[PDB]
Amino acid sequence: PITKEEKQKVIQEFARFPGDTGSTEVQVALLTLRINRLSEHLKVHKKDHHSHRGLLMMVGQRRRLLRYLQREDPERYRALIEKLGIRG
Amino acid sequence: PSRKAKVKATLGEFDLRDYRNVEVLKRFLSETGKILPRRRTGLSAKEQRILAKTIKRARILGLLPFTEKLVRK
């Protein structure tokens, strides 16, 4: 699954400052974690469609938070995209 | 009938999650192996459906009967 220790690592990685949990950066991090997990599980289990929908949803949320970020702070969006390898 | 006396009244404090404990559990099924209706056990929906799952575990363990024969008749 995803253990709390792991999730913590990614938050305490991606926070803007000590104490930040819900900022855009951290969210797109977590979202991406979860996504990469889910597509690993969907490489096998090609038959599991009901989870796959959930991943479509996850993906869409990711892309939206990104659309926002890039509307505000293009250099920080460059940052995120460099870190998680997304959009390319 | 069937509202006469209810099971959970008689029994004291007990683990509903224990499949290993026969003596508590055997109370909750009928003359046949059948798990008893709510009115007869008098448990909440949650309780009932938990007892189900632990009874079925106990069954697979060979502890409680899957079914019995009806005497009298």
Binding site: - | K8, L11, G12, E13, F14, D15, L16, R17, D18, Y19, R20, L43, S44, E47, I50, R57, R59, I60, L61, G62, L63, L64, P65, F66
Partner: protein, 101 residues
Amino acid sequence: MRRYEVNIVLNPNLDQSQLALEKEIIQRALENYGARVEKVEELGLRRLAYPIAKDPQGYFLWYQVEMPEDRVNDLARELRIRDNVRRVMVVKSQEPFLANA
């Protein structure tokens, strides 16, 4: 790491060397699948509510262990390879839920 209860039921007609051998081999199965053994309750020969391998009784071993999840099923399957073992039921541990208290 997670907490499971391993339910093993053996044949009641075993002599002592045979019993100690089986438990030796179940021990080895646990050791070699990476499971730490927290507790054991051995109840023993007890009347089944229906025949198992056309046997009116059954021999009851209970373990409480903690092992890596990815291996669980393998371990369980290992325990069934043995001839003298009749049921093996392996359940994840969950704290009591007690009605009427």
